[PDB]
Amino acid sequence: STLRLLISDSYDPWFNLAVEECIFRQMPATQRVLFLWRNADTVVIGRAQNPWKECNTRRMEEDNVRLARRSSGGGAVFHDLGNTCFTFMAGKPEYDKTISTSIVLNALNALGVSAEASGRNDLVVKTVEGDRKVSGSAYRETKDRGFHHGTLLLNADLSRLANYLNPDKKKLAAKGRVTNLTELLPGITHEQVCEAITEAFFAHYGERVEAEIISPNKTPDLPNFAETFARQSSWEWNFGQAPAFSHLLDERFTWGGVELHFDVEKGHITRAQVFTDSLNPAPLEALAGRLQGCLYRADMLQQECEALLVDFPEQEKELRELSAWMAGAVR
């Protein structure tokens, strides 16, 4: 058909993320994909975060909470089985964010819930006591495709995340809602919401297909899956070793916190590593790239940092701020 419908029968977050990674980059942009899944207890961190600073790893081990690192930026997210998650993908020009958003809204309507879009990302139910968030999401575009994924809060434990994160004093010093569906719909299950999104998906495209039910015990019909799954679940990718440097500079900006670890010998940086919870870590990863071998002196720290501007027009503020902050922090 023109449709693929993938239903994960696994709570393994490395398995579920590896499928998403195949939808986004492995699969041909040539069908319309809906993938429906959830994870057992997991902290998902952005690709540039340092879990040894961010997470109470001892508590995680004691409570049997998993760590997964995703390949986009941003901060920590908590998953459990009371989150029902969805990923849509479709080729351009045909697809844009509005289709999948409408499909999920219809799904929610079919369930007896009056929901609306709110911002570029969220879905919200109108309430006597004001707007309540029932869904988070993120949208990404490629040259060949659009890609949309998010979660629905059916019966999430909302308190839990804070037990697994370390206090961040500078995040605290700086400064700059949500409801479970089970609060409205006491019987609601994962399977019912999956059923509802699938129907709204089939109704939209005028077509039906059989569900491919997928789990780690056999290869899904996704190219390069075995390798993507070996990488996604590897300790070295999800955790990695703690940074071991002799200097550390850190700051919380409005667009994210930044930790910069490095060594200085003979007045130059001999090695450096940057961490961040910024939504776009690319300009920070590329700063780390340009800091190697740099003269440890504000004029050069700023020259290296500002040499990147031409290639990051949308992040010019981020870079101007990092640059000013380093000039101030080094003296």
Cite the annotated binding site for (R)-lipoate by residue number: 133
Main-chain phi, psi angles of 159, to 5 degrees:
-75, -40
Amino acid at 132: R
Amino acid at 59: R
Radius of gyration in angstroms for the set of CA atoms belonging to the chain, rounded to a whole number:
22
CA distances for 45 relative to 50, 62, 71, 147, 187, angstroms? 9, 19, 9, 19, 31
Whose tokens are 């804070």? That residue is: 162
Token readout for 3 is 């449709």
Amino acid at 172: L
Q: Measure the CA angle with vertex 87, ends 197 and 66; round to 5°.
A: 115
Nearest alpha carbon to residue 230 among 21, 23, 55: 21
Length of the chain: 331
Binding-site positions for ATP: 70, 75-78, 133
Token readout for 217 is 């015990």
Furthest CA-CA distance within the chain: 68
Provide CB contacts within 8 A for 144, sequence distance 6+. Answer: 29, 91, 92
Is the separation of the CB atoms in 154 and 190 below 8 Å? yes
Binding-site positions: 70, 75-78, 133
Whose tokens are 């701020």? That residue is: 321
Q: Is 23 helix (H, G, I), strand (E, B) or coil?
A: helix
Q: Where are the beta strands (DSSP E) in the chain?
A: 3-8, 32-37, 42-45, 66-69, 77-79, 83-91, 115-118, 122-125, 132-141, 145-153, 212-214, 247-253, 256-265, 268-276
Rounded to 10°, the helix 13-25/225-232 angle is: 130
Token readout for 220 is 């899904």
- For every residue of 180-199, DSSP letters joined together read -GGGT-TT--HHHHHHHHHH
